[PDB]
Every structure is written in structure tokens, then in C-alpha cells.
Design a protein around this ligand. Structure first.
Ligand SMILES: COc1cccc(Nc2cc(-c3ccccc3)nc3c2C(=O)NCC3)c1
Ligand SMILES: COc1cccc(Nc2cc(-c3ccccc3)nc3c2C(=O)NCC3)c1
Ligand SMILES: [Mg+2]
Ligand SMILES: [Mg+2]
Ligand SMILES: [Zn+2]
Ligand SMILES: [Zn+2]
Lengths: 321, 322
């Protein structure tokens, strides 16, 4: 009966605002595994790429295992939500028959692994406390390089190589794209990514659907697409959004509590925080400029997402005065 | 022995230092003694309040992480790049341009720039599905690892030569060292060269022809090209040095070839099928000379003696071709 309700909730996999937190309770805490299996079935990705079903389950569970169950925001539920959101953006009418099967595979895999083994703390925290991770990666996209190293490394585990039947050319190319996509999720790169997206909207070329052309534009589109999915919480129905905020504030406060345990200045402070004002500014300066520009690329496919974000923005603002 | 090395070292400020003899007479400690002399000379120990024993401890531990069994990418190559940078930092046209901190980073970077090199290329490591390429997502694989090793060794007991620096000082130098080492990757050559060409066209300079570099972007860029130049300086040294570096890179390459043929890899590096001579002319013409000429255009006329040797060696190597 739980499998019954689980399978019912999975009927909404193609819809913005899927009940991701319920799917997580109903799956026995395997949102990423169940959401990823259902998406591969939907898009016929097992057959196309000859992925044995048992290998795909075995990898998915191992990766899911490598998201930390004690990090409030950057955990497996978030990875799941990011995969399903890229899945929906990939389906936009303005991009129909634009991306190859291998590019579709790259974007969804990249979404799955994009935050794996996330410690619940910022790049800057890891730089300033002189941690193994920052020493390893020379202070440069430290977390995102790690996510990638981990997401690939897990393919080598027993019965875990989901790409065993791709050609060597397919695999080299998929690898390069996954790396390019996942490094583009570092927020220190947001302003530069959005510049390029604006330029592409401004020089946009369309059919009587979107034309590309060359690897450089296609990759930028995929990079911006997964960044949008990554920052999609404030575009979701408000009950989903509000839970996403409580979780990121918890993680943010746990980090400030560790910076205090150290005599570090506090970036994060649970006796200073102004949650509602911070969310309004997040949307106004970061989240709305990205989604406005994305909506422009795919006009008018994303109008309802954009209307949703604007409503949520107003709601949060309304809590202030 | 301690007398001969004393005297050989008195040439530390000269292009064409007898670096192989120094390695010999120091008991394979050329990076320790060359770095040590340099810090004394430049007065880097008083300026940065470095206890003598800490530098020595670090330098020895740093040098031990160069592989003795790799024919080019070892501690003699790291002693050599260090010394070559130290001389280029003394270019008339760069007089009083860089701070004591920036001089320190250039020279620290030089020293660590190849540490723990396996004697094989980034493309090898990407093709052998290596663990280092897995870790660094195929980007500047070697170069990222050299840095992470260099900095980690400072945390060993009595190896933190930076202990008496302030916190802003440590951040800044850490940043500079990384930008400088990442620039040693040859994949980045052409892009750095174009940028240096840009700087020369639109260059500034006082009435002594001393260059004026205000912002970080321009100064780091110069220190990047300066250490890249030092790395690629072997063809510009006296012939009896150049030849010795060339035999050594050719051995390292032919050994990578062996490691390949073996593993069933397509052999890249091929000893039963290379012209050492023609490959050197090729290398000078397409990479080393466009580089040191452009550098020469920046500090005109100061790099003249250097560019002249480079062109006299190209001529000699081309004379070895029937
Ligand atoms: C892509 O990398 C990263 C890294 C850290 C946080 C995020 N996301 C957020 C940040 C913030 C936030 C909070 C206070 C000040 C500034 C920003 N608020 C939210 C999210 C989110 O996506 N969901 C819920 C609302 C994304
Ligand atoms: C900085 O990165 C790297 C990597 C590999 C070789 C080098 N340097 C050389 C390469 C080659 C060479 C020879 C044949 C074909 C292509 C290149 N010859 C020489 C050096 C050198 O610097 N000293 C001795 C002469 C530099
Ligand atoms: Mg992330
Ligand atoms: Mg190197
Ligand atoms: Zn994320
Ligand atoms: Zn080198």
C-alpha cells in the first residue's frame, strides 16, 4: 500500500512541483534512486544505452548513500529535486529535438551527482579553516570538483558502471560534458554564466524551436539549465519552497555555530538572521534575474514558473512590514 | 667539497649557473642549497622573520618529494627553475616593480612547481584512467597536484616557513602561488603568450624603461609568464647545459613510451622512431622562441644575451641535421 502510494506520487514526475518530500518518505528514503529509475524508464534511456536495470539500481543506491543523511539542505532529497527539475526543463517545447540522447543523459547524470558528499558548509568555510578539501583543490570550486570526483569514482564499484556499453567516444564526450555542467553550479560563476545566457537570448535564432549549432552554445544552455534546476526552489509552490528555506537556514546556522566555536567572524547567525528579507534579496538579485532570462530563451514555455516565483517573492515581502 | 660548492654558488645571480655540479657536490641537495643561498642573498629570512632551521627543514622535506628516478622532472629541474626566476626577477626593466611578498611567491612557486611528478604527461594520466585525473577532473592534473603537495608539507613539524607572516600576507601569497603554478601547464601556453603580446603592444614604462604595473591582473600575468619562461629556459642556457636537459627529457619521454606500448596503449615518446634533433628545432621554432622573443620585447633590451644564446643553440641543433 505504501508502494501503491509511492507509485501514484511518481505519476507526477513530468510536472513542476512534484511532492518530492513525500516521495522520499514513501520510498524508504530513496528519492534519488526512485526518481532517477522512473526518469530513465520514461525516456527509454536503459534501452538506448544498454544499461542493465540491475546495474542502474546498484549505482543509484551507492550514490544516494554518499549524500549525507545529517545535512539539512545539501542531501539526497535536493539531488532528487534537481534531477526531476532538469528532467522537466529538458522537455520544454522550445527545445524539442534540440539535444542528443547523450546530451540528455549528461544533463540528468550531472544533476544526480552535482552535490554528492556535500559537508553542509561553504567553499569559503572550507578555504578559511584550511581543510583537506581546499588544500586538495587549491581553493578553486573546491566542493564542485569533489562532487565530480566522487560521482565518477562510484562508477568503478562492483556492478556500478552504468556506462559500460557506451562507445569510448560516447564516454569521453559524456565525461567532458558532465564536468562542464557540474563546475557551472559553483555560485562564484553565476554572474558570468548569466552574462552568457543574456547574450544568447539577445542573438537568439528560432524556427517557424531553438537553433544550436555548435558545442559552445549547447553546453552553455545545459550549464544554465542545471543551474536553474539547482536554484529552482523559489519557483516551486510555496509549501515546497518554505520547507527548502527552513533546511538551508538550519545548515547556514549550524555553520555559524562552528565559526563561533573558533573565534571566526560570523558570515549564518541565528540571533541576527532576517530570514524573510534575505529571501526577498536572494530572489531579487540572484534568482529572478536568472529565471527571467531563462524564460526569455524559451518564451513562453516558462511563464507559469516565472509567475510562481513572483507570487512567492511578494508573499515573502508581505511578511516583512 | 664545501669549498668548491661555496665558489660554484657565488654564481647564483648568473645565467648559466653550473647546476649539475651543485647537485653533485651538495650530495643531491641542489634545491635546498640553491633556495637557501637565494633567501640569504635577497635577505628573505630577516624580511619575513624565518627561523633558519625551519627553512632548511621545509626545503629538505620539499626536495625529498621530488622523485630521484625520473630523468627530467626532479629536484635539479626545480633548483634550476628557482635560480632562473631569481635572475629574471633582477631584470633592469623590472627594477622595484614587485614587492617582497610577490618576490617570495614567484620563488616559492618555482620551487614547488613540479613536486611529486611521476615522469608522465597529463594526457597519459587522463588515458590511464589514473587516480590523479579522477581527482582533478582532467583539468591541469599534474599542476593542481604539485601545489597541493607543496602546501601540505608546510604543516609537517617545523616546516612552516610562513609562520611569522600576517594573515592577509598568507592569503595573498597562497593565491599568487596557485595562479603562478597553474600557469606552468603547457595547455595554457598559447593563451598566456597572446596575453603577453597584448601587454607589449600596449606597454607603459618610465624614462629608464622600467615597466609600470598597477593592478593585480597585470602583475600576476607577468609573474606567470616569468616562471613559464624559467620553466622553458633550458634552450636559452649555455649549450653544455641545454644538451644535458635534452638527453634527460628524451629519456623520461621514451620511458613513458615503454609504459604505454606495454599497457597495450597506442604509443605516443617513440624511441625506435624519433629525430631528437629535428624535434628540438621544431620546439624552439614553434614554442620557445616565440615566447622568449615576446618576453624580450617586454624588457627591451635586457633579455638580449638570453635571446642570442637561444638562437645560437637553434643554429647548432639544426647543424646536427644532415
Ligand atoms: C548553488 O549553490 C547554493 C549554495 C548555497 C545556497 C543555495 N541556495 C539558497 C540560498 C539561500 C540564501 C539564504 C540567505 C542568504 C542568501 C541566500 N536561500 C535559499 C536557497 C535555496 O536554494 N533554497 C531555499 C532558499 C545554493
Ligand atoms: C612545462 O611542461 C613541459 C612538459 C614536457 C616537456 C617540457 N620541456 C621540454 C620539452 C621538449 C620537447 C622535445 C621534443 C618534442 C616536444 C618537446 N624538449 C625540451 C624541454 C625542456 O624544457 N628542456 C629540454 C628540451 C616542458
Ligand atoms: Mg552545489
Ligand atoms: Mg610542470
Ligand atoms: Zn545544489
Ligand atoms: Zn617544470
Amino acid at each position: 500500500a505504501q508502494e501503491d502510494v509511492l507509485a501514484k506520487e511518481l505519476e507526477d514526475v513530468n510536472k513542476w512541483g512534484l511532492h518530492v518530500f513525500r516521495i522520499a518518505e514513501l520510498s524508504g528514503n530513496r528519492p534519488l534512486t526512485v526518481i532517477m529509475h522512473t526518469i530513465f524508464q520514461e525516456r527509454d534511456l536503459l534501452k538506448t544505452f544498454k544499461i542493465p536495470v540491475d546495474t542502474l539500481i546498484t549505482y543509484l543506491m551507492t550514490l544516494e548513500d554518499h549524500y549525507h543523511a545529517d545535512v539539512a539542505y545539501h542531501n539526497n532529497i535536493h539531488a532528487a529535486d534537481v534531477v526531476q527539475s532538469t528532467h522537466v526543463l529538458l522537455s520544454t517545447p522550445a527545445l524539442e529535438a534540440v539535444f542528443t540522447d547523450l546530451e540528455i543523459l549528461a544533463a540528468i547524470f550531472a544533476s544526480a551527482i552535482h552535490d554528492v558528499d556535500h559537508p553542509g558548509v561553504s567553499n569559503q568555510f572550507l578555504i578559511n579553516t584550511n581543510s583537506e578539501l581546499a588544500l586538495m583543490y587549491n581553493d578553486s570550486s573546491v566542493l564542485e570538483n569533489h562532487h565530480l570526483a566522487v560521482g565518477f569514482k562510484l562508477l568503478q564499484e562492483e556492478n556500478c558502471d552504468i556506462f559500460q556499453n557506451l562507445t569510448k567516444k560516447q564516454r569521453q564526450s559524456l565525461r567532458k560534458m558532465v564536468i562542464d555542467i557540474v563546475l557551472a553550479t559553483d555560485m562564484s560563476k553565476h554572474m558570468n554564466l548569466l552574462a552568457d545566457l543574456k547574450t544568447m537570448v539577445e542573438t537568439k535564432k528560432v524556427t517557424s524551436v531553438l537553433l544550436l549549432d555548435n558545442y559552445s552554445d549547447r553546453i552553455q544552455v545545459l550549464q544554465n539549465m542545471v543551474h536553474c534546476a539547482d536554484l529552482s526552489n523559489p519557483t516551486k509552490p510555496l509549501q515546497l519552497y518554505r520547507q527548502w528555506t527552513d533546511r538551508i537556514m538550519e545548515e547556514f546556522f549550524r555553520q555559524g555555530d562552528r565559526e563561533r566555536e573558533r573565534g571566526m567572524e560570523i558570515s549564518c547567525d541565528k540571533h541576527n538572521a532576517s530570514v524573510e528579507k534575505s529571501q526577498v534579496g536572494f530572489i531579487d538579485y540572484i534568482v529572478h534575474p536568472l529565471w527571467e532570462t531563462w524564460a526569455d530563451l524559451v518564451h513562453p514555455d516558462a511563464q507559469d514558473i516565472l509567475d510562481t516565483l513572483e507570487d512567492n517573492r511578494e508573499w515573502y515581502q508581505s511578511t516583512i512590514p
